[PDB]
Amino acid sequence: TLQDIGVSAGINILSAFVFFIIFAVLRLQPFNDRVYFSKWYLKGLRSSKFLNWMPEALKMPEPELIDHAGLDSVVYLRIYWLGLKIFTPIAVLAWAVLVPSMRFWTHIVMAYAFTIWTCYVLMKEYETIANMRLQFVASEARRPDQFTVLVRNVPPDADESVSELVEHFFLVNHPDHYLTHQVVCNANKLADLVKKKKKLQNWLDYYQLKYARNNSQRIMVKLGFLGLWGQKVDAIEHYIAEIDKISKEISKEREEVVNDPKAIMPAAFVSFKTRWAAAVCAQTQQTRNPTQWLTEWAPEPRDVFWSNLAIPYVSLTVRRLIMHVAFFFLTFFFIVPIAFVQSLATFMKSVIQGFLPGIALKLFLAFLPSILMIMSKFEGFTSISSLERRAAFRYYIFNLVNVFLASVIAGAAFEQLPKTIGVAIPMKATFFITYIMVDGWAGVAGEILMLKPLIMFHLKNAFLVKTDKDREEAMDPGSIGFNTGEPRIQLYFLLGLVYAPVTPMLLPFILVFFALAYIVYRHQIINVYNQEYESAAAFWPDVHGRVIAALVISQLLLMGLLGTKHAALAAPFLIALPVLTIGFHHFCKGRYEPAFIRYPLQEAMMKDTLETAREPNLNLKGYLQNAYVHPVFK
Amino acid sequence: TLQDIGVSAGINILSAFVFFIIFAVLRLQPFNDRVYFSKWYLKGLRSSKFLNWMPEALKMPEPELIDHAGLDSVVYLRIYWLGLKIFTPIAVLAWAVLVPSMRFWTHIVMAYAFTIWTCYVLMKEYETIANMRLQFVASEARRPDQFTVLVRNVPPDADESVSELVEHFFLVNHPDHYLTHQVVCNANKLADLVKKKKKLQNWLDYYQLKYARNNSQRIMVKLGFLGLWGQKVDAIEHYIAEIDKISKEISKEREEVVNDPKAIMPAAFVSFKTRWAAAVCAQTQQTRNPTQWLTEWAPEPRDVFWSNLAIPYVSLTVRRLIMHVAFFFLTFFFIVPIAFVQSLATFMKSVIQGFLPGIALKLFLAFLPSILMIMSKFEGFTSISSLERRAAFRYYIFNLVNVFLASVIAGAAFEQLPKTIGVAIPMKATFFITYIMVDGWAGVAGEILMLKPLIMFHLKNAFLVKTDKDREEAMDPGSIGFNTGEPRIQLYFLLGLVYAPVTPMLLPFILVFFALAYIVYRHQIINVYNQEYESAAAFWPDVHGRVIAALVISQLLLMGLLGTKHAALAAPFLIALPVLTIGFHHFCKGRYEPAFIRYPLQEAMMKDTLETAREPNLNLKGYLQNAYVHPVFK
Structure with missing residues (x-):
């Protein structure tokens, strides 16, 4: 429905332009500067025709941006740039080869080219991110999480307290390097x-x-x-x-x-004198039993999710099982609303049938990130970073399973009044164009307004602000929203890759969304969105794995669609492609992911030597003993 | 062909009895005591009606056997006991349920029971082996391999030698623990x-x-x-x-x-003062680049395969590729002889057609372990233990691919004068009974004679012995022959599991082979077969993984065979079984395999403390500096 696509694009363009006009009006007003410039305020820099902010956002290059915001923010921003790099040449080449049995082989060679290009871009970006992470970790200032290790599941003793056990064990096993320890307390x-x-x-x-x-x-x-x-x-x-x-x-x-002794959990935070000793402890099996004295890197104090440290370790397996069961029930119940959306996606009816499904789905998915975050929070992870990564992973799984696969299959079933899926699958290009359009261009354009934070801030000013110096507390910009940003862009990656060799009409709007999201989120990173936690882009392995999974899914669906026409003979190549992709992913794993999941001892020793040279009189024990206690006990 | 099976069993029984008679005659003779009692001689214990050796072999229980032979030998012996434990109840239950649409569900439930029992036995034996390995490693005497680490791929420098680079790097990174180092020399x-x-x-x-x-x-x-x-x-x-x-x-x-500087390879052996420091170095990423300063446990000097340390590391990928290509050519060319054996497997013709295929195949596979060992030796592994494990793994792969799968498919093709594989696959029970019979009972019975070592020893006495004190050098019992023993028993495991629910006539001869091999190899471990290398049963993870793979293959073939009959409805269970098996294998991995692939630091520190208490005046540097040099340089 070209006319429906056109009217949807037009109305979304008007909506975006109106959003930008409203943003321009609000930004020049002085009393909402507090909310529209949350950063430059939490950092202590500022106090008290229109669309030039877009080119103003391109200034302040990568080093200044990194030091200003955080490498997590910078890498998350670079995800959109990666999307542009992947889908610009793919889009232009696909359009050139589709606009002037040969059809089948042409598509096969196009798939080969697309897979090769995506793999090369992923490899280069992976290497660049690894180098950036190593450089940032080397240059990073002192934090208590670089010397501290979270010990889980200390074996119980009849007479020895948890503190006594930890002290004795670590004095025996890590002499001359163990400095102090803190015991996890159950103060929920x-x-x-x-x-x-x-x-x-x-x-x-x-x-x-x-x-x-x-x-x-x-x-x-x-x-x-x-x-x-x-x-x-x-x-x-x-x-x-x-x-x-x-x-x-x-x-x-x-x-x-x-x-109360009963409030002592069987876990503790251990702090060493040297990053080298901490890294040694954090990467090695500690005891005969691989379920006792479990060891992992300790999150920094503002990142530790204290409410979950009280969960006994033995129940985590039961919890994860309950997670998977509940996620199954959710993903099974949630076809019905999206099936209803597809039903809505059947001149007065043309415009509504072309526009309404996208906005309906957007409302239907509004609280889903909140639900998934609640579920993960329910089943302990002890760190906001890991909670966000797990929630994003579950949102990506549900995203793939339902809103792409189940949506397309239900829509094909509705279209069918043998297996006509071969002609049915590409036909939902129209619906996906609509959904991407609305949840992309207009979605981001409304996102920049911060309508909800602005309303909340003015409500606090009107009814809660009694004096000064409390507006600082009333201001709360929020995080980057990784849990929402990462899975949406992953859906777009997957969907563009899947429909790239069958329906090239998709790709231009993906490219436009990538550009617009890049610019808006860059402005957001520059001026707002203080980070909650400072990870060293530990999620990049997950992002790369998700992109590779999307690539494999695209190859498999290409094989399925091309396997319907008689005399296809595409199997002996479309079965080889997934093997090549998996092999490339394994090579990238073994060649780079150590930089993300392991801490090189030479780097640790170099960092330690430089720090001790710069400050030969650093009271590390005093710096660490009173940290990692609890938010409650000040 | 019941008559052919009977005559083959009878002739093999006569052959085994004759072999045992000849063994009894030779054992009581005094001048071949040197070869029939190679152990008790290399250990310095001895100098200068009939079948009672079988019950005499059961004496000397596990602790004495371990200290006498080696834990590798003891675990390899226990593999046969594991086979008995797996296949006794399976055999008896299968016979009871086959000898007095229900057939299909009966087989499905039987498969469920067999898989559950095999998994439980594997889990218990895995735990027992892990405990035995940890105990033995804790109790082990001092060896230079407990303090030494093999550093691979030292980055080249224009001015610094490899020795200087290693010394500087390890002094910087591992202070107070680095003791000495030796540089690998190319003296091939x-x-x-x-x-x-x-x-x-x-x-x-x-x-x-x-x-x-x-x-x-x-x-x-x-x-x-x-x-x-x-x-x-x-x-x-x-x-x-x-x-x-x-x-x-x-x-x-x-x-x-x-x-010559050109003879210095970019690798070196590093020795530390403490097992704790060595374990720390052997388990942690060393530098930013995960392909430089590569680190792994150092094999003990009699185990190090010095001829391969001269292979530059950068060519190992090319080598492994050449390995896989050559293995493909071998496994493709080698159907033709086994296809010929199947052709031979079509009253004067009945006996030969029932017996000849087994002996023909046994001759055809005689040099195959030698070829595979030559290939692995060609592509470097730097340790006899790893060479043997890799050669056994390749022999198992070829074994599965050809002599089971390709043999059965070629035989079905010959039998076929749609898909009659459903009735064809069980029919080669006859041929497999023959092959197992001959390569089992009679094969082991001939194995105990040591005909080839005996002939070689007498030839040395006749033509090479000029004086005394050289018969000690002329005696060379050989290793346990893991490279041959492990893959044959794995084939038997796989084949018994696959045909257990379809042709229970298989299982009794598997059980008999397991018992006879256990007794004969126990006598061999007791009296002969000095070990070349002392690993701590590092191959058990491989053995368990192979058994699990055989279980999965058996389940898949059961699904295929049962999927031919109409109204089967066995898919919704025979697709769930492999998932359950893989999940169980993952749990066993995460719950035990750390005891095999990682060295707990508390164990290392305890061992170190006990040793330094027992010998407070141990010259470790003098003990280690002159070791690990080369066999050639004395």
């Missing part, structure tokens, strides 16, 4: 009490400001219409009593958890 | 010259003894009939001149190789 209940106190205090402050502004009687018990079985005409004394009671409860809980 | 030419000298000296000694015994003229120039274009009527002066010339050449080559 205390943290929950403190969070409840904070919420109640915020509610009290809101009510106090409201009564100060207007002297009346408010009798809404937490709901207004059908609230609590009470009156609470004033409720200020009620909230004061609540605050006092919660403070006493929190003090009692602090006292209990300080001296 | 010198070793070849020395071997030629030894051969010429042996020939000279033979001729001298011959002329001393009989004073005549011998004019055979190395061939007798069509020898060299010469006379050599006496040739004693000729051989003396040859010895003198080769001695001068060897002296010159020694002088050249001592001072």
Whole structure:
């Protein structure tokens, strides 16, 4: 439906242009500078015709950008550039070869060329990212996570405490290098009490400001219409009593958890004097039993997800099983809404049938990242970085399984009123153009506005800000949103690769999305989006593996589609291609991924020598002993 | 052909009984005690009605056997016991359920039971072997390989020698623990010259003894009939001149190789003061580049295959490619002889058609282990242990690909004068019974005789022994022959598992072979077969993986055979079984194989502490500096 594609593209262009106009209007206004310039503010740099921001964003090259934002941000930004590099020549060559049995062999050779080019680009980008990571890790300033190691599943003892066991074991095994240790404490209940106190205090402050502004009687018990079985005409004394009671409860809980042995988990953080010793401990089997004294790199304190360190290790297998079962139920139940979207995708009906499915799907997938993050958070990983990577991986799996595969198969079933899938599969190019268009150009254009953060910030100013110096706390830009950005771009990679040799009409809009996302997210990295955690792009192996998986899937679907026409004879080549791709992936693994999953001892020793030369009087023990304790215990 | 099976079994029983009679006659004779008791002689214990040796072999339980022979020998022996444990209940249950659409489901449930039992037995034996290995490594006496690490692919430098580079790098990276290092030297030419000298000296000694015994003229120039274009009527002066010339050449080559920089390979052996430091170095990435300063455990000096350390590392990929190509050519050419054997496997013809194929195949596979060992030796591995493991792995691959799969398919093709493979595959139970029978019972029975070593030893006594104290050198029992024993038993495992649920007539002869091989090889381990190298059963992961692969193959062939009958409906279970098996293998991997592929630092430190307590005055540097040099340089 060329007319539907055209009208959808036009309306999305108008939406994007309107979004950019609104952004320009808001940016020049002075009182939302706090939210539109969250960075340059958290870094302590600023206080207190229109579309020139796009070329202004290209300044400040890679080194300054890295030091300003973070290598995670820079690599995530480079993912879009990688997409452009992969899909520009593929698109131009495909268009040139489709616009002036030979058809089949032509497609086969085109697939060979596309796979070769994608592999070469992936290899070069992989090497570049590995070099950047090694350089950044070498140049990085001192952090407590470079000397600290998380020991899991300390074997229980009848008489020895966990602290005594860890101290004795590490003194025996790592002499002259073990410095200090901290024991994981189970303070989830205390943290929950403190969070409840904070919420109640915020509610009290809101009510106090409201009564100060207007002297009346408010009798809404937490709901207004059908609230609590009470009156609470004033409720200020009620909230004061609540605050006092919660403070006493929190003090009692602090006292209990300080001296309760039952709150000691069988895990601890160990800190060494040298990065070399830490790296040695973090990469070697510790004991006969490969399930005791388990060792892994310790996340930096702002990254450690303290709420999950209380999960006993023995139940993680049960948990992962529950994860897979629940994910199966989710991915099975979630065809029905997307089947409904396909049903909607059957002149007054033409425009709506061409536009509505995309926006409907976008609303339907709005809370899905939140659900997946909740699920992963439920089953412990002890680090926000690992939680985000796992959530992105699950979102990619669901993405592939349902919104591409299940969507296309259901749509073909609807189109069918033998196996006409061979002619059916390319026909959903129209629907995918629509969905990519709306969830790409217009989606990013609306994304730059930060409508929700802006509304939230103004609401805090209107009803919660009582004095100064609290707007700093009210400002909270949020993370880059890896959990959402990575799987969406992976879907686009996969879908463009799959339909590249069959429906080249796809590729131009993929390229446009890649460019627009690159520019907008570069502006975002420059001016907003302070990072929550500083990993050294540890997710790049996952991203590369996902791209290779998409490539294999594209090859297999090409084999399936081309295997329907008689006298195909494409099997003896389309079965060889996946083997070549897997071999290339294995070579890249063995040739580079060590730079991401292992820490070279020469690098560790060089870093240590340079640091000890620069600061020969560094009190490492004092620097490390009071860290890694808990957010609650200050 | 029940009559052919019976006559083959009978004739093989007569052959085995005759072999045992001959063994009894030879054992009581005193002058072949040297060869029939090679052990108890290399260990320095002995000097200078019939079938009671079978129960005498059961004495001397596992600890004494381990200390007497080696844990490699003990584990290899236990492989047969594992076979008995797997195939006794399977055989009895299969016979009970086959001898008094239901047929299909009965077979499916039987397959489930067999897979479950095999997995449980494999898991228990895996755990037991891991415990035995850890205990033996802890209790092991001092060896130079526990402190030494082989560094491969040292990056070249314009001005620094390899020794200088290694010394500087390891002093920088592993302070307070690096002790000494030795540089790999390329003396392959010198070793070849020395071997030629030894051969010429042996020939000279033979001729001298011959002329001393009989004073005549011998004019055979190395061939007798069509020898060299010469006379050599006496040739004693000729051989003396040859010895003198080769001695001068060897002296010159020694002088050249001592001072030639070009003979220094980019590799070296590094020795540390502590097992802990050695283990740390042997398990961690050393530098940014994962192809420089490559590190692995160093084999003990009698195990190091010095002839291959001269191979530049950069050509190993090319070599492995040539390996795979040559192995493909071999496995493709080698159907023709086995196809001929199947052709031979079509009353005067009944006996020969029932017996000849087995013995023909046994002769046809006689030199195959030698060829595979030559190939692996050609492409470097630097250790006899790794060479044997790789050769066994390739022999298992060829074994599976050809003599089971290709043999059965060719035989079915011959039987076929659609797809009658469903009825064809079980029908070669007859041929496999014959081959197992002959290459099992009679094969082992002839194996115990040591006919070839005995003939060789008597020939040395007759023509090479000139004085005393040289019979010790003339005695050479040989290794356990892992390269041959492991793949044959793996074939039997695979074949018994595959035909267990379809042709239970197979299993009894497998069980009998397992028992007879166990007893004979136990006697061999007790009295002969000094080990060449002492590994800590590092091959058990390979053996277990091979058994799991055989299990998967058996499940897949069961699915294929049962998928031919109409209304099978066995796919939804026979596709689930391989997934369960792979999952179980992954769990066993992650739960035990670390004990084989990694060295726990607590164990290393405990061993070190005990040793330094027992010997507080051990000159480790003096113990290690002169080791690991070369066999040639004494």
